[model samples]
Target: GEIAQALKEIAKALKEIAWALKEIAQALKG
Candidate 1:
């Protein structure tokens, strides 16, 4: 499905972005 293809790209991006948000927040707070 086309939707799955979109999600496949998004899935990795989601993980990277999720980690980036936590890392940025921790660094920014300190």
Candidate 2:
């Protein structure tokens, strides 16, 4: 249960990074 909790946060953080990359990609178009 404890290990899964940590992985969950990391998963969210990684997902946030993916969103950031998408933002940068949009800026590249301009």
Candidate 3:
């Protein structure tokens, strides 16, 4: 259960970070 929870957190963080990077790239283009 701990491993599963940790994996979930890691995945969520990665998703958020990816989205933030995309936003930053779009801002840079503008």
Candidate 4:
């Protein structure tokens, strides 16, 4: 259960990071 919880947190962080990078890319393009 602990390991699963950690993995979920990591997944969430990765998703946030991915979204941030995408936003930056769009801003640069504009």
Candidate 5:
């Protein structure tokens, strides 16, 4: 159960990073 919790946290962080990268790319295009 503890390992599952750690994996969930990592997945959430990665999702945020992906969102940030998408915004950065749009900014660069402009």
Candidate 6:
């Protein structure tokens, strides 16, 4: 259960990071 929770947290963080990076890339393009 702990491992699952840790993995979920990491996944959420990674998703957020990926979204942020995408936004940054779009800003750079414009």
Give the per-residue lDDT of model 2 (tens digit) for 1-30.
Answer: 999999999999999999999999999998
lDDT of 3 by residue, 1-30 (tens): 999999999999999999999999999999
Rank candidates, TM-score, best first: 2, 4, 5, 3, 6, 1
Pairs of residues at least 3 apart in sequence or in different chains that clash in candidate 6: none
- Each model's backbone clash number: 0, 0, 0, 0, 0, 0
List residue ranges in candidate 4 displaced over 4 A: none
> lDDT per prediction?
0.96, 0.99, 1.00, 1.00, 1.00, 1.00
Assess candidate 1 and give its TM-score to the true structure.
Answer: 0.49
What clash pairs does model 3 have? none
The list of candidate 1 runs beyond 4 A from truth reads 1-6
Across 1-30, the per-residue lDDT of candidate 1 in tens digits comes to 999999999998999999999999999999
The deviation in Å at residue 19 for candidate 1 is: 0.4
**Candidate maximizing TM-score:** 2
lDDT of 4: 1.00
Candidate 5 residue runs with Cα over 4 Å from true position: none
Q: Residue 9 deviation, candidate 6, in Å?
A: 0.8
State the TM-score for model 5. Answer: 0.75
At residue 8, give the lDDT of candidate 4: 100
* Cα lDDT of model 6 by residue, 1-30, tens digit: 999999999999999999999999999999
What's the residue-level lDDT of 4 in candidate 5?
100
Clashing pairs in 4: none
Candidate 5 local distance difference test against the native: 1.00
**Model 2 misplacement above 4 A:** none
In candidate 5 the C-alpha lDDT for residue 10 amounts to 100
Model 3: number of backbone collisions: 0
TM-score of each: 0.49, 0.84, 0.71, 0.75, 0.75, 0.71
lDDT of 4 at 18: 100
